[PDB]
């Protein structure tokens, strides 16, 4: 009949804080011993973290787990709306599974989009993705961030295997943990960019890193399903999908292309398109948040 007063969806697709450290070129195999790069203070006063002179390569390591159980809310007010909402996620996953979304998530893991202000001048980034089955590697992967684009949808068999792995995760049929290590040649003594605190850089125990939701916004760049005349590219998924740096705010509630009007048109009265905006609303439910009154 109507919408519940509260409706929260928890965080599936959980990233960690990517630990960054120094390293040398063409030594990509035995990665266990390199010192983590911390943050120093210079001159009102600024905190600056720089690579050493004999360290031309930056390593970033992050372990993405995926939870699964996509359209399962945690806090509601009525069982009728919950039953219809589970019916909508059911007819999604039976109409078409986690096939188009997971290829985009595996693409954003494949290209080093999570290296935010280092990929803009990165001469060579390689990524190794290890699927952790029991305590060690089950299946390994090997990509280069340059050969994979950042705006067009490529195709590979190994990337189809990684998409099938993440899809077997998000559908609820396994425990999925992916250790991603990215080696990036930057050269001697440039400026790496760990995240900034409330100018103070972020470090956990004398070791700088990138925040968790920074990397979590790196892979949420799967929204191409919006009615603009092109020129931006793939944007991140939010209700009234918007970019804070540009100041532009698409999907505005005058034009029915947002999350909420699409929700009460599809869940209550069954109006939603085939693929595109359905992929947007399921990607927002996978991201999670609080909806309702």
């Amino acid at each position: 009949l109507s919408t519940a007063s509260v409706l929260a969806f928890e965080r599936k697709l959980d990233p960690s804080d990517a630990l960054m450290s120094a390293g040398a070129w063409a030594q990509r195999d035995a990665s266990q011993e390199w010192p983590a790069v911390t943050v120093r203070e210079k001159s009102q006063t600024v905190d600056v973290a720089n690579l050493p002179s004999d360290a031309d390569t930056l390593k970033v390591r992050f372990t993405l787990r995926v939870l699964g159980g996509a359209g399962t809310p945690s806090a509601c007010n009525d069982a009728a709306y919950r039953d219809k909402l589970l019916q909508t996620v059911a007819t999604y996953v039976n109409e078409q599974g986690f096939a188009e979304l997971a290829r985009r998530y595996a693409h954003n893991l494949a290209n080093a989009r999570f290296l935010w202000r280092n990929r803009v001048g990165a001469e060579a980034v390689e990524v190794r993705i290890n699927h952790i089955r029991q305590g060690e590697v089950a299946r390994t992967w090997r990509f280069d961030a340059l050969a994979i684009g950042l705006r067009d949808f490529k195709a590979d068999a190994e990337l189809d295997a990684l998409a099938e792995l993440i899809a077997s995760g998000l559908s609820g049929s396994g425990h999925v943990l992916l250790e991603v290590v990215a080696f990036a040649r930057i050269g001697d003594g440039q400026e790496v960019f760990p995240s900034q605190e409330l100018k103070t850089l972020y470090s956990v125990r004398d070791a700088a890193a990138i925040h968790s939701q920074k990397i979590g916004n790196a892979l949420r760049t799967i929204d191409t399903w919006y009615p603009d005349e092109d020129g931006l590219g793939p944007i991140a998924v939010e209700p009234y999908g918007s970019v804070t740096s540009q100041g532009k705010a698409y999907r505005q509630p005058k034009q029915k292309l947002d999350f909420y009007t699409l929700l009460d048109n599809w869940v209550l009265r069954d109006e939603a398109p085939a693929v595109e905006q359905q992929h947007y609303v399921i990607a927002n439910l996978i991201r999670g948040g609080v909806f309702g009154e």
Binding site: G121, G231, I235, Q246
Partner: protein
């Protein structure tokens, strides 16, 4: 100097502009010291409407020598994903009087009073207020960021376009300074 290269920065949520222009000009001084820096310097076309904003287009301005033998063919560019640059040609023949240049002013009196300290081991009251820059601080209108190159902290390049009167032209120098042009065409 009749060979041009219009580099148009593609919009993205991935890196909001101006920092982007500094990555560009830092990859320009990168490929400067390969050869020498007397002939080619940069421009900023069709993008000086608001009087503090440069924008997203950098035109390469050497005549056919240091276009297809400096950066394009005989170098590795870099970014190549937010630009998607094209193929050169020969320029038209307007009369825009052809001048751009750079400037640097003073906006922090601490540097000047530090060199007043080491002037002649001067006492600190004249080092503070002889005629200081503490009364007013200057500001130059178009701006880039420009991280440094070797063993030091970041520069801050301020550029200004010269006399844009459509009267005449002359045969001038290519690039005075380091990597910004002298006489450059304007459409």
């Amino acid at each position: 100097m009749d060979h041009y290269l219009d580099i148009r920065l593609r919009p993205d949520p991935e890196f909001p502009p101006a920092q982007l222009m500094s990555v560009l000009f830092g990859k320009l001084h990168q490929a400067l010291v390969a050869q020498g820096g007397d002939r080619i310097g940069v421009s900023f076309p069709d993008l000086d409407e608001s009087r503090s904003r440069l924008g997203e287009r950098l035109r390469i301005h050497a005549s056919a020598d240091d276009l297809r033998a400096l950066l394009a063919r005989p170098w590795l560019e870099g970014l190549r994903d937010h630009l998607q640059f094209g193929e050169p040609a020969v320029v038209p023949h307007p009369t825009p009087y052809r001048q751009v240049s750079r400037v640097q002013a003073k906006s922090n009196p601490e540097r000047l009073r530090r060199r007043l300290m080491r002037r002649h081991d001067l006492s600190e009251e004249e080092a503070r207020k002889r005629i200081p820059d503490t009364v007013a601080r200057t500001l130059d209108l178009p701006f880039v960021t420009l991280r440094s190159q070797s063993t030091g902290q970041h520069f801050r390049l301020f550029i200004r376009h010269g006399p844009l009167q459509a009267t005449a032209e002359e045969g001038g120098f290519t690039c005075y300074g380091l990597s910004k042009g002298g006489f450059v065409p304007w459409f």
